[PDB]
Amino acid sequence: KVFGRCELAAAMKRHGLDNYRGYSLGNWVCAAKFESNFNTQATNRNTDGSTDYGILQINSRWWCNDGRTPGSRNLCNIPCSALLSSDITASVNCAKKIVSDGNGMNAWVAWRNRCKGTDVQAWIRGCRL
Ligand SMILES: [Cl-]
Ligand SMILES: [Cl-]
Ligand code: NA
To answer: Which of 15, 63, 80, 115 is least buried, going by the fewest C-beta atoms within 10 A?
Structure first.
């Protein structure tokens, strides 16, 4: 599913991401923009042989099982393919674990490089939320 910007904001808000671990909604929408371009089916192979999955490009080294990432964990207890669904519940629940792991949203390198410190409220402008 390719979400609209405000469509995704509303779903992330409904699932409790607005100020989860202190991160406003615009931070989450900005991260999804630059991780997946709001496409739930996005996948990207990393140099370490892990893969990132879904709207927030959650990685198979720690967070989900894809059966092809040696020595990895599955701390969200889900198959990585569940992160590609049109329903973002699994991606949000797992994202809550990731942002709780110690480094906040810096876990998403694209958030750190493209969203952190920017006018992230712009990402929810116009939305009826
Ligand atoms: Cl915001
Ligand atoms: Cl933090
Ligand atoms: Na894994």
So the answer is: 15
